[PDB]
Amino acid sequence: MGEELNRLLDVLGNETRRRILFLLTKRPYFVSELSRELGVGQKAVLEHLRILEEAGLIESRVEKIPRGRPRKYYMIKKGLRLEILLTPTLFGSEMYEAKGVRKSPEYEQAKELIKSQEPINVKMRELAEFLHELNERIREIIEEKRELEEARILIETYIENTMRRLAEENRQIIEEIFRDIEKILPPGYARSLKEKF
Amino acid sequence: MGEELNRLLDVLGNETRRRILFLLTKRPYFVSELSRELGVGQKAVLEHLRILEEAGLIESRVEKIPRGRPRKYYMIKKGLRLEILLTPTLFGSEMYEAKGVRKSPEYEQAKELIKSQEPINVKMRELAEFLHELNERIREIIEEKRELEEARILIETYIENTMRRLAEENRQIIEEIFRDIEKILPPGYARSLKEKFL
Numbered sequence A: 001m002g003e004e005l006n007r008l009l010d011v012l013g014n015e016t017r018r019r020i021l022f023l024l025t026k027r028p029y030f031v032s033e034l035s036r037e038l039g040v041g042q043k044a045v046l047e048h049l050r051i052l053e054e055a056g057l058i059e060s061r062v063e064k065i066p067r068g069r070p071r072k073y074y075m076i077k078k079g080l081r082l083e084i085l086l087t088p089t090l091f092g093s094e095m096y097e098a099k100g101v102r103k104s105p106e107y108e109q110a111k112e113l114i115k116s117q118e119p120i121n122v123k124m125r126e127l128a129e130f131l132h133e134l135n136e137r138i139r140e141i142i143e144e145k146r147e148l149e150e151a152r153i154l155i156e157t158y159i160e161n162t163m164r165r166l167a168e169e170n171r172q173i174i175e176e177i178f179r180d181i182e183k184i185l186p187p188g189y190a191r192s193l194k195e196k197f
Numbered sequence B: 001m002g003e004e005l006n007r008l009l010d011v012l013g014n015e016t017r018r019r020i021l022f023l024l025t026k027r028p029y030f031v032s033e034l035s036r037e038l039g040v041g042q043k044a045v046l047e048h049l050r051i052l053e054e055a056g057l058i059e060s061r062v063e064k065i066p067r068g069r070p071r072k073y074y075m076i077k078k079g080l081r082l083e084i085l086l087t088p089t090l091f092g093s094e095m096y097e098a099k100g101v102r103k104s105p106e107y108e109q110a111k112e113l114i115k116s117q118e119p120i121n122v123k124m125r126e127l128a129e130f131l132h133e134l135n136e137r138i139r140e141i142i143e144e145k146r147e148l149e150e151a152r153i154l155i156e157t158y159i160e161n162t163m164r165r166l167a168e169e170n171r172q173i174i175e176e177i178f179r180d181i182e183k184i185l186p187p188g189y190a191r192s193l194k195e196k197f198l
Helices: A003-013 A015-025 A031-038 A041-055 A105-114 A121-171 A171-181 A186-195 B003-011 B016-021 B029-040 B044-055 B105-115 B121-171 B171-181 B187-197
Strands: A058-062 A072-074 A079-086 A092-097 B058-062 B072-076 B080-087 B089-096
Touching: A003 A079, A003 B003, A003 B016, A015 A031, A015 A041, A015 A072, A015 B003, A015 B089, A015 B121, A031 A041, A031 A072, A031 B016, A041 A058, A041 B029, A058 A105, A079 A186, A105 A121, A105 B121, A121 A171, A121 A186, A121 B089, A121 B105, A121 B121, A171 B121, A186 B044, B003 B080, B003 B089, B003 B171, B003 B187, B016 B044, B029 B044, B044 B058, B089 B121, B089 B187, B105 B121, B171 B187
Parallel strands: none
Antiparallel strands: A058 A072, A079 A092, A079 B080, B058 B072, B080 B089
16 A cells, blocks of 8 residues: 555544545635634644644645734645545555646636626536536546556566566576666666566 | 545545555455454454445455355455545545446457567567557546546536535525536535535
C-alpha cells in the first residue's frame, strides 16, 4: 500500500477532521466558527487543523486589522485535486493542482452554461444534462484506461519474470538485452529493474 | 456531509481494513492467509471483513471440496468503481458498477508478442516499444480525464452552491428544481443533494 494513501486515509478517518473539511468546502472558517458549529472546542480543532495542514490538505492565511489580534483563517489548499480510487485491481490516491490541467472545451461550455442569463430552473436542468454527459464520457475513459493497463501489467510481468528466470543460468545475454532496452522503458520502470537484478 | 462519504471514510480509516483491501487487490484471500500475512488474528480479521462486506466493498464466495469444511474466500466486489474526491469546493464519493466485460486489442497484441517464437532479445525490444506506446496512450487518457473532471467539478460546485443560496429565501422553487433534476443526475449525487438541503 502507498505511503500517501495510508497517511491520507488516517487523516480522513477521524470524523472531526472530515467534518472540518466539509465546512471549508462552503467557505473559509476562523477557528472559533468551527468550534461552535461542530461544538468541539478550540483545543481539539486547532489540533485537527494542524494535522490537515501537515497532510497538505488545507492552508491558513492571516488577516489583521488595526488594534486587533492576528486571527488566521483556514481553507482547502488552493487548486487541490485529491482522488482516492478503489477497484478490483487498484487501491490508490492522486494529488494534483488544478493549474497543471489544460482548459478544455467542456470546461468552457460549463463555464458558459453557468454564466448564462437563463432562468434558475432551465440552467439547473441544462447543467444536469451536461453533467450526465460528462459522466458517461468519464466512465468510457476509465474503462479505456483499465484495458490499457491490463496490457501494460501483462507486459511488465513478462519482462520481470523472464528477466529473472534468465538471470540465472546466463546473466550475460540478459545484460545485453537490458542495455538494449533500458533506454526505451520509462525511466522509473528501468531503474526498478536494474536495481532488482 | 454525505451519509455514504462518512461511512466509507470510517470504514477506510482503520489501518487493518485498509491493509485488507490492498491485499484483495492482488487476488482473493481466505481468512487464514490474511491473518498470517497481516499477523492480526482470525477473530479480528473476520470482523473487519464483515465491516467491509456491509459497506459493499467486498464479497465472499464459498468453495467446497469433498470431505472438507466449507472454507469461504474474499474478493473486492466484482465491477466495483469507487472514487472519493476533495477539491476546494467539493467533497464526495461515487460508487458504481462497471459493465462486466471486455479484453482489448492491446491486451491481445501483448499476449501475441509474448507468445511469439521470436528470439528473447527481439521480443524484449518489441515488448519494450509497445510498452512505451501504451504509456503514452495512458498519459493522454489520464489528461483527458483530468480535463473532463474540471468541468464536472465546476458543475457540481455551481449546483450545490445555488442549491443552497436559494434554499434560504424560498425553498419552494428549489424543491421543484430538485424534483425536475434528481431523475437526471447520477443517483449517488442526487441522494447526496437531497439529504443535505431538503
